[PDB]
Amino acid sequence: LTQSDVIAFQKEALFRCINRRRVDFEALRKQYELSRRECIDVSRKLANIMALIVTLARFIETFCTDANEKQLCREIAQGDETLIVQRSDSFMKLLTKYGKPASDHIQELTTELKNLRKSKEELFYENSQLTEEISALKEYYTNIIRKYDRDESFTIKRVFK
């Protein structure tokens, strides 16, 4: 655990420790990958039902005559899960109220598409940058720790002057 205690440890046992760590790491890594795959799955599932509901709130917003109705629809489109549940009852109350089966409007709809298009292109760019950063970061910090360990190694300094 410390360099002095390693000098105290025995040299075959250090190899056995290295392979204990290698196989523990491989376990942990298959575990990490399973976890991430689940997390991506639930997140895309959530992303999809949220997309359904905030898109719904915008159209039902368009059909509301009451200031409060429009307020609820807009707060829902904000896309916060907690608020969405809480306002769910009033939103259905609103949907029941307005469910009973021009030019400028399509213009807005396509404006929002382009804005989102631009938002998604950006979000993708920043995701790419974030992944790069994690990798850079693990590498940067590991390097500093390697250097610290080398600088407190005495065998090193006596082998090299």
Binding site: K11, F15, I18, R150, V159, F160, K161
Partner: protein, 149 residues
Amino acid sequence: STPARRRLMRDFKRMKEDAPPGVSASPLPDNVMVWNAMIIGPADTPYEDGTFRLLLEFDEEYPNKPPHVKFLSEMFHPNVYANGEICLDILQNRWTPTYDVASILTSIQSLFNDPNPASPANVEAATLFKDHKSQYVKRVKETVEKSWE
């Protein structure tokens, strides 16, 4: 007896008085003529901290002719044949009898640091050096860790 064994002996005193950092070498107590060596992979190279052992085989035409030098430890380097032979110019085409065992070992660590893909002995390593540098440093690193036995 001869001047060759005495030149080997001057090389020894050289190692004892001025041992280059991260190298060691000594001939068998009986046979001044054969030498155990070892290089340590310098810092900041992918061979960092390795403890590679080396065999030097001399004869009676030295310092005129160099010894044959081969790594004993398992190796992975573009300038190393699968049998230890080393593709170094100072040993194959630019030798000078002024060179001693110390100088020879120092040049080999210089090579651990500067692989020469232009005279590739081991193909796999000269390629991985250029195509898959991460797979290369992984290969070399498992080499370094087996060297510790």
